[PDB]
Ligand binder design. Structure first.
Ligand SMILES: Nc1ncnc2c1ncn2[C@@H]1O[C@H](COP(=O)(O)OP(=O)(O)NP(=O)(O)O)[C@@H](O)[C@H]1O
Ligand SMILES: [Mg+2]
Lengths: 355, 330
């Protein structure tokens, strides 16, 4: 194997952006939070851009609000650094982007359009695109020496890297102006849409295209995506013990390799290290003998053999990933016996990641 | 207390929802197998273009045709329909507006993709309309083509809007035939022909969304079917012992005695590790039971499926179908 050393990465202030990538549901958000907290405890001025924090986690951080903007997290006075946090508001980041490029006056029209409000702001990939936008804003205001980026959940970890350019290309389709705001073919398509779709809706849509007055969206997605290639960017891929999460991690590491983008390593989350050395087979047999003859001793034996089997599966999964990627550093994080919903649990998690 | 009231046996349309990653696709497939046993014919439908059925069965992407994908017990048959929204849109233009020519022109420039993407409501009309068409289709003898239709449905955060036919039709051209068929779709969804099952895991968010989805769907007067708790694990401890272990109390002298009996003596570090191993197990079971308790609020049938220890393969689908069958699903 290899040992990922998140501690040295976090402590080194030439690393300005840390992106937590992986499937959804593998521990990205809590991992991002543990990393941002530990970086503050190392003395850095950190902001964590969380996407979907658990209600309780967001409260431990004081960001259970609707703001679309970072707030200081109160930590113990001894702490040399500063932890600030926010939760991406997809719709509000869309509003800010629209105003930034159309201006506040035109923005009142765009923001009032019911097609913008009900369709445009919930298209596929809006969440990745606005995460990248918000990241752009954070970089430009130079309000922090460290930005830790949670990334939105998806069954597909590469969505973070691919959905934004994809959505941009959709927004720049010729079909917007031609079909909503003549030719034999385009005239056919236009007729079809007019005959199938509601008049109110087509009016709102053509209004939206007119007002926005944008290849604008793809160009934005490209510029913002290049930020991920500035010196000082680190990706951390997080995966659970499961085969699916690991496979998404592998896909993602592959893409990072092809693009020569810095991969810090893999966080292999939710493991079950053995605390007792009793072999599995022994464990089973011993319990079966007791089964033939105080239930408690047999049950403890079955707990332990079950855990042992799970550990075997985990070890062989990681061995697969390490075989395919012998160059990728790893840190294994055991499943902790409590929920990660308070600054104290964040501290125990960060202890697991940093060592 | 039963997981499958007899009324669910007369349901013709089963919609399987649940939060992402809880196993909608797996369970919708096992449910289809369960209802297909005994020489019946059931259609398994997915609606999101995700080719999840083909992925589940480890086969290449399925085309827009109903095709036999699995044999059920005693000669039953499960067909698969990965609904293709673009083809469904073309079908719609030709059948209801005789605009097949325009439609085939749109396919050439990517315009059907555009129209389905831009209008969310049209999309849901097409999908729900196709579902209704498969539910009500009759053969040469005026008999139903399918004994049941099982839909791998959109997830809990979208299922209520997905089934919101009135809102879907709101953004379509007024008059014409679409509004005629939409009344029929709403009737089907609100009848005793339909049921929505919600898959959940014993984790906080899947349960929270299960509860919220059940609430939203009851306000719409859509029929709830079962909550299906997926990937259960064995407690291995009796309730009193469990409760004690979740607090750190294990009464080791008893454990040392049991081990001594079993011909095994452990060093003290190993014994301490074994004690820690069962406390953590008990903390996990206790947390799961606490989450589970939140479902007790609903007067909804509850089904339970085990964890398949390795990756879900075809034999696993049959194992899960057997568990449903043993719980009364039929
Ligand atoms: N009882 C079970 N035991 C073990 N693994 C399971 C079980 N049920 C499902 N799985 C696995 O759980 C993962 C998620 O299941 P899946 O059936 O894909 O869920 P889903 O609800 O379809 N999620 P999505 O389609 O992403 O919204 C898959 O990798 C399955 O193979
Ligand atoms: Mg699925």
């Amino acid at each position: 194997p290899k040992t990922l050393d998140m501690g040295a990465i976090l402590a080194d202030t030439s690393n300005r952006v840390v992106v937590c990538c992986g499937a959804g549901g593998v521990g990205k958000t809590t991992t991002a939070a543990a990393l941002a907290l530990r970086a503050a405890e190392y003395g850095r001025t950190v902001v964590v851009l969380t996407i979907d924090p658990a209600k309780r986690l967001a409260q431990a951080l004081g960001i259970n609000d609707l703001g679309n903007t970072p707030q200081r997290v109160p930590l113990a006075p001894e702490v040399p650094g500063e932890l600030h946090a926010m939760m991406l508001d997809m719709r509000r980041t869309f509003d800010e982007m629209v105003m930034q490029y159309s201006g506040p006056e035109r923005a009142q029209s765009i923001l009032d359009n019911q097609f913008y409000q009900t369709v445009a702001t919930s298209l596929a990939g809006t969440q990745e695109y606005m995460a990248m936008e918000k990241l752009g804003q954070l970089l430009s205001q130079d309000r922090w020496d460290l930005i830790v980026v949670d990334t939105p959940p998806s069954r597909n970890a590469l969505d973070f890297l691919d959905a934004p350019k994809r959505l941009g290309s959709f927004m720049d389709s010729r079909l917007w102006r031609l079909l909503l705001a003549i030719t034999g073919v385009m005239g056919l398509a236009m007729k079809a849409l007019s005959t199938v779709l509601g008049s109110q809706m087509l009016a709102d849509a053509a209004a939206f295209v007119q007002s926005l007055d944008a290849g604008g969206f793809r160009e934005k997605a490209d510029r913002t995506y290049a930020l991920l290639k500035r010196r000082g960017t680190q990706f951390v891929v997080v995966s659970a013990a499961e085969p699916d999460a690991l496979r998404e991690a592998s896909f993602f590491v592959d893409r990072l390799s092809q693009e020569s983008m810095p991969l810090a390593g893999l966080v292999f989350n939710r493991t079950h290290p053995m605390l007792c050395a009793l072999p599995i087979e022994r464990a089973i047999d011993a319990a079966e003998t007791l089964d033939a003859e105080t239930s408690l001793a047999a049950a403890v034996l079955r707990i332990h053999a079950e855990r042992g089997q799970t550990a075997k599966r985990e070890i062989r999964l990681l061995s697969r990933f390490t075989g395919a990627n012998p160059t990728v550093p790893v840190v294994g994080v055991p499943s902790l016996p409590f929920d990660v919903s308070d600054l104290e649990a964040l501290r125990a998690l960060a202890d697991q990641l940093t060592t | 207390s039963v997981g499958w009231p007899s009324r669910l046996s007369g349901v013709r349309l089963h919609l399987v929802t649940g939060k992402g990653g809880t196993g909608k696709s797996t369970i919708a497939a096992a449910l289809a197998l369960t209802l297909a046993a005994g020489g019946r014919k059931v259609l398994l439908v997915e609606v999101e273009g995700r080719q999840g059925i083909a992925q589940l069965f480890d086969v290449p992407p399925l085309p827009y045709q109903e095709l036999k994908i699995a044999t059920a017990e005693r000669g039953g048959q499960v067909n698969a329909l990965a609904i293709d929204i673009e083809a469904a849109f073309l079908e719609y233009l030709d059948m209801f507006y005789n605009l097949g020519i325009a439609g085939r022109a749109m396919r050439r420039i990517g315009a059907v993709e555009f129209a389905t993407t831009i209008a969310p409501g049209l999309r849901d009309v097409l999908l729900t309309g196709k579902i209704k068409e498969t539910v009500v289709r009759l053969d040469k003898n005026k008999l139903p083509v399918y004994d049941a239709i099982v839909v791998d449905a959109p997830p809990t955060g979208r299922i209520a809007r997905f089934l919101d036919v009135t809102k879907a039709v709101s953004d379509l051209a007024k008059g014409g035939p679409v509004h005629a068929q939409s009344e029929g779709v709403v009737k089907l969804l609100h009848s005793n022909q339909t049921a929505i099952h919600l898959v959940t895991l014993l984790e906080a968010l899947p349960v929270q969304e299960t509860l919220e989805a059940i609430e939203e769907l009851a306000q719409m007067e859509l029929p709830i079917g079962s909550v299906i708790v997926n990937r259960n694990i064995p407690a291995h401890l009796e309730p009193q012992d469990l409760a004690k272990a979740a607090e750190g109390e294990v009464d080791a002298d008893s454990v040392r005695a049991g081990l001594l009996t079993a011909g095994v003596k452990l060093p003290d570090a190993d014994f301490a590790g074994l004690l820690t191993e069962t406390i953590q197990h008990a903390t996990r079971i206790t947390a799961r039971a606490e989450i589970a308790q939140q479902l007790d609020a609903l007067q909804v049938p509850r089904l339970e499926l085990p964890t398949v220890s390795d990756g879900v393969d075809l034999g696993s689908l049959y194992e899960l179908s057997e568990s449903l069958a043993q719980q009364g699903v039929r």
